[PDB]
Amino acid sequence: MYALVEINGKQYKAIEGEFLKIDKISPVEKDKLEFNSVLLINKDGEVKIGKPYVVNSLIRCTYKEDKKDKKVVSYRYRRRKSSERKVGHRQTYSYILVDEIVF
Amino acid sequence: AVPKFKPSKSRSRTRRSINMRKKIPQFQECSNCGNLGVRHRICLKCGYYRNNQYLEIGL
Amino acid sequence: MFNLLKPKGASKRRKIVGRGPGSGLGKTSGRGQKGQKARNTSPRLGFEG
Amino acid sequence: NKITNNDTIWIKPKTVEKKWYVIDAADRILGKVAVDVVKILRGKHKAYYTPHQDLGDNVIIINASKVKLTGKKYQQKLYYRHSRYPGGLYSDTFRTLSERKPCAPLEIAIKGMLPKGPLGRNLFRNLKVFSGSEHTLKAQNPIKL
Amino acid sequence: ARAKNGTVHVARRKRILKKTKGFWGTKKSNYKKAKDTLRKGMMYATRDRKVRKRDFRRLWISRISAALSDTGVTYSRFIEGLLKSNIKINRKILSNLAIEDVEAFKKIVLEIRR
Amino acid sequence: LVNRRYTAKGKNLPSSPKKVRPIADNIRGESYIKAIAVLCSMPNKGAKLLEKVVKSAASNAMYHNKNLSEDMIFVKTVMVDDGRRRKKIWPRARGRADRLVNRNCHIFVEVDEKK
Amino acid sequence: IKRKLRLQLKKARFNASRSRSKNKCFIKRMENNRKIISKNNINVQVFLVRSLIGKLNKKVKVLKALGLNKIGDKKVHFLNESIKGMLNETINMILLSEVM
RNA sequence: UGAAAUAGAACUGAAACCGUAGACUUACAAGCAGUCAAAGCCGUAAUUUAUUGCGGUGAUGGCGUGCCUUUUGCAUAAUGA
RNA sequence: ACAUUACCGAAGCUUUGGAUCUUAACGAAAGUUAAGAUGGUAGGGGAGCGUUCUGUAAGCCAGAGAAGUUAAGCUGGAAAG
Numbered sequence: 001m002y003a004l005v006e007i008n009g010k011q012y013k014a015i016e017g018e019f020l021k022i023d024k025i026s027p028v029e030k031d032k033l034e035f036n037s038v039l040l041i042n043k044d045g046e047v048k049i050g051k052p053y054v055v056n057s058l059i060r061c062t063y064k065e066d067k068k069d070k071k072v073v074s075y076r077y078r079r080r081k082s083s084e085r086k087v088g089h090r091q092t093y094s095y096i097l098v099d100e101i102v103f
Numbered sequence: 104a105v106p107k108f109k110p111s112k113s114r115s116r117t118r119r120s121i122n123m124r125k126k127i128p129q130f131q132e133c134s135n136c137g138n139l140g141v142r143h144r145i146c147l148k149c150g151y152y153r154n155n156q157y158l159e160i161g162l
Numbered sequence: 163m164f165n166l167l168k169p170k171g172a173s174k175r176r177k178i179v180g181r182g183p184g185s186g187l188g189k190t191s192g193r194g195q196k197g198q199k200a201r202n203t204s205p206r207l208g209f210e211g
Numbered sequence: 212n213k214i215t216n217n218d219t220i221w222i223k224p225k226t227v228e229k230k231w232y233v234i235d236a237a238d239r240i241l242g243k244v245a246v247d248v249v250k251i252l253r254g255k256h257k258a259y260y261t262p263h264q265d266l267g268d269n270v271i272i273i274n275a276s277k278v279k280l281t282g283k284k285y286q287q288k289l290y291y292r293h294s295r296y297p298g299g300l301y302s303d304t305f306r307t308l309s310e311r312k313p314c315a316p317l318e319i320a321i322k323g324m325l326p327k328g329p330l331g332r333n334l335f336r337n338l339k340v341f342s343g344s345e346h347t348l349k350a351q352n353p354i355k356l
Numbered sequence: 357a358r359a360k361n362g363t364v365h366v367a368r369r370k371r372i373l374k375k376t377k378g379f380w381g382t383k384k385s386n387y388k389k390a391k392d393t394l395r396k397g398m399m400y401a402t403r404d405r406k407v408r409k410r411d412f413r414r415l416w417i418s419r420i421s422a423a424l425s426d427t428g429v430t431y432s433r434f435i436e437g438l439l440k441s442n443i444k445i446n447r448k449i450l451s452n453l454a455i456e457d458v459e460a461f462k463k464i465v466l467e468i469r470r
Numbered sequence: 471l472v473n474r475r476y477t478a479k480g481k482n483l484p485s486s487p488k489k490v491r492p493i494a495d496n497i498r499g500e501s502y503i504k505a506i507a508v509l510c511s512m513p514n515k516g517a518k519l520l521e522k523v524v525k526s527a528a529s530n531a532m533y534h535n536k537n538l539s540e541d542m543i544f545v546k547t548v549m550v551d552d553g554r555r556r557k558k559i560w561p562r563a564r565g566r567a568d569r570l571v572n573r574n575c576h577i578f579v580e581v582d583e584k585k
Numbered sequence: 586i587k588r589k590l591r592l593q594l595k596k597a598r599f600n601a602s603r604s605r606s607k608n609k610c611f612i613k614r615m616e617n618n619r620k621i622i623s624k625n626n627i628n629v630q631v632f633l634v635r636s637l638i639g640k641l642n643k644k645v646k647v648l649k650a651l652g653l654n655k656i657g658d659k660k661v662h663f664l665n666e667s668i669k670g671m672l673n674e675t676i677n678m679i680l681l682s683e684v685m
Numbered sequence: 686u687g688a689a690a691u692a693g694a695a696c697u698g699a700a701a702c703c704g705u706a707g708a709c710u711u712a713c714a715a716g717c718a719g720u721c722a723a724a725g726c727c728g729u730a731a732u733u734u735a736u737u738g739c740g741g742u743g744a745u746g747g748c749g750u751g752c753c754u755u756u757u758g759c760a761u762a763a764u765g766a
Numbered sequence: 767a768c769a770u771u772a773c774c775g776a777a778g779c780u781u782u783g784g785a786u787c788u789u790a791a792c793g794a795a796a797g798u799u800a801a802g803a804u805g806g807u808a809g810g811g812g813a814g815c816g817u818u819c820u821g822u823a824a825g826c827c828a829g830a831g832a833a834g835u836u837a838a839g840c841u842g843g844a845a846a847g
């Protein structure tokens with residue numbers, strides 16, 4: 001059993017007991033998350049597809065932590081112009097543990 | 104008539120390893136002393152060759 | 163340790179020039195491309211060419 | 212802890228098991244036949260298609276000598292080749308090339324339509340063309356198409 | 357007031373060499389070649405970070421088109437019906453679905469054809 | 471790695487490493503008898519230099535391990551590095567001079583009791 | 586092949602390779618815009634749909650006077666003679682919808 | 686002997702350069718040698734254990750005309766190492 | 767060529783996460799929000815890293831291991847630490 005769920009406009013494939021890495025969510029909502037926009041549910045054989053959301057179907061999750069990714073570097077330079085620029089970056093991600101898929 | 108660009112270490116290594124390669128001489132143990140001598144040459148250690156003395160080996 | 167605590171703006175740094183591309187005062191060092199002025203000079207005598 | 216990877220899935224080529232497909236070329240049009248063959252060979256009919264690796268099936272073409280053309284191509288299509296020696300340009304019309312090598316036109320067309328590089332050459336290795344209506348790969352139980 | 361201590365250039369070079377480890381030939385040890393190859397590599401890294409989005413979307417589209425080859429729905433029409441029936445599922449999701457669980461994707465297609 | 475009890479080292483020998491390495495390749499891993507025969511046979515300066523170093527290494531091993539004879543020994547490893555260089559002048563036409571480098575080599579041989 | 590001729594030919598082929606479907610879409614948009622402009626004293630929403638790069642200087646000035654700087658720019662304006670004239674100048678780069 | 690002799694005519698001993706050993710890859714292929722994807726092999730940590738990561742190698746796919754200076758304009762077969 | 771419905775397709779547009787600056791509002795202020803605005807050579811303005819010496823420093827940290835290369839790991843938006 002799994003769910004195809006939209007969080008903040010990004011699809012994910014949620015499975016129970018099992019973490020999701022999503023875009024950083026505000027400190028305000030670091031307590032207990034409920035997501036109401038489920039696109040698809042596959043339960044033990046049979047599948048329900050929402051138009052655009054499957055009604056009466058929730059996903060309940062517990063916020064766990066925030067974690068930074070590996071560092072990336074944006075670099076550019078202009079040939080035979082003696083000019084460049086370098087910028088570092090590290091994106092932040094939030095990890096949520098899916099408890100149950102209200103099906 | 105002059106190198107246009109410095110060759111890569113791969114090319115230099117390849118050429119050097121192929122060219123600077125010496126081959127082992129064949130051997131055959133002397134019937135007299137048991138030394139390993141060059142095949143078809145007088146033994147340098149005892150002087151015999153096919154059971155015939157030819158040298159008188161000194162110091 | 164008593165931290166003299168200089169007033170702000172009391173000493174500009176300098177206009178160190180010709181020390182890299184990132185400083186904005188790089189190879190050409192504020193002089194432009196070529197000509198008389200690129201090489202130390204300008205005809206002084208209130209000159210109008 | 213375990214993370215649900217919401218990333219594109221890649222299927223290990225050691226768990227994909229290649230079949231053979233028979234395609235008949237009788238009374239078909241050369242380009243259409245070649246296009247079908249390329250689509251099968253490339254792997255573009257499987258959900259896990261990947262241009263990196265070789266995941267498509269193999270193809271046996273039968274009756275390759277009965278491909279039909281339209282227009283005056285039978286008299287006018289030219290197959291060129293160059294010996295790399297000076298002036299050594301040799302042409303060969305469709306008639307003559309077909310008579311000398313019955314499988315050559317279809318092999319040439321499929322080679323042109325396949326991608327280029329090591330994988331393209333491998334894909335062409337994955338193809339068998341027969342002039343007649345019978346093939347020697349009976350041991351593979353090829354699926355007819 | 358002589359200000360010579362040259363513990364700077366070796367530092368720059370050590371960082372560069374650390375980042376340029378696996379390169380071919382003399383590009384991994386010489387300072388000049390390593391710096392040239394690294395600098396063009398980082399620019400490639402930026403460009404390619406933006407290109408990876410295009411590449412993966414193209415892959416997903418091709419996979420969807422392959423999974424639909426069976427049925428009679430050209431996937432332009434598939435996207436058509438998808439939007440028209442108001443199913444806002446994603447190209448990545450559909451591509452992965454057609455591999456993990458083919459029958460769900462097939463059911464989606466039956467549902468689109470309406 | 472080295473059992474430095476069993477090894478010989480010859481520093482600044484009068485030959486170029488580029489010329490001594492092939493002879494080393496021909497005896498690496500061979501038995502002591504075979505290697506000694508090869509070096510005696512082959513009429514190369516590097517061959518004679520290796521012969522001296524190899525014989526010395528075997529002598530050291532025997533001296534420190536009295537129950538090891540000439541026919542349980544095999545040449546385990548052989549390394550040939552480059553040593554000091556000397557520059558001398560070779561004068562050419564039109565007053566042009568060229569510098570004429572003379573190279574030396576270090577030789578390291580370790581023997582070991584055969585399999 | 587002579588360079589003068591091949592440049593002419595390449596340019597002519599590029600120009601002639603336009604799609605009638607795209608032309609029909611553009612014609613439909615123009616008709617809609619003219620129909621809207623023909624009205625009088627209504628609030629109209631103006632979207633900018635074509636870029637400012639490469640266009641004429643006068644027309645860039647008109648668009649910046651309407652308030653649109655980028656593609657995707659949204660501005661509501663009250664149709665009087667001034668706005669009608671500006672819209673007529675820049676009709677080919679805008680999309681007009683009506684604010685009920 | 687000396688605290689040390691990879692302190693023995695020399696302290697700390699890098700880079701360029703020359704090597705040895707082990708692991709991986711390579712002899713049907715047209716690679717500014719890199720980046721983005723990626724099977725297999727090897728090292729390693731977790732999850733009861735062969736599927737996920739830190740790693741090193743990398744078949745194959747996509748993209749990509751070294752750099753500096755000078756010019757209306759250079760991968761340019763303009764200049765310089 | 768003429769019609770109908772589409773889709774693909776850029777660093778454009780939209781959305782998500784993060785940073786700086788201008789203006790405006792709120793706030794005692796710090797800052798919090800709203801709006802837009804940030805390709806860029808010549809060239810102008812502004813903000814920092816790092817090296818050596820001097821006062822701080824007859825301070826603090828070192829033979830229980832200073833300085834320096836050297837392997838690995840980590841942080842910072844860049845100089846880097």
Ligand SMILES: [Zn+2]
Nearest residue numbers: 133136146149
């Ligand atoms: Zn003898």
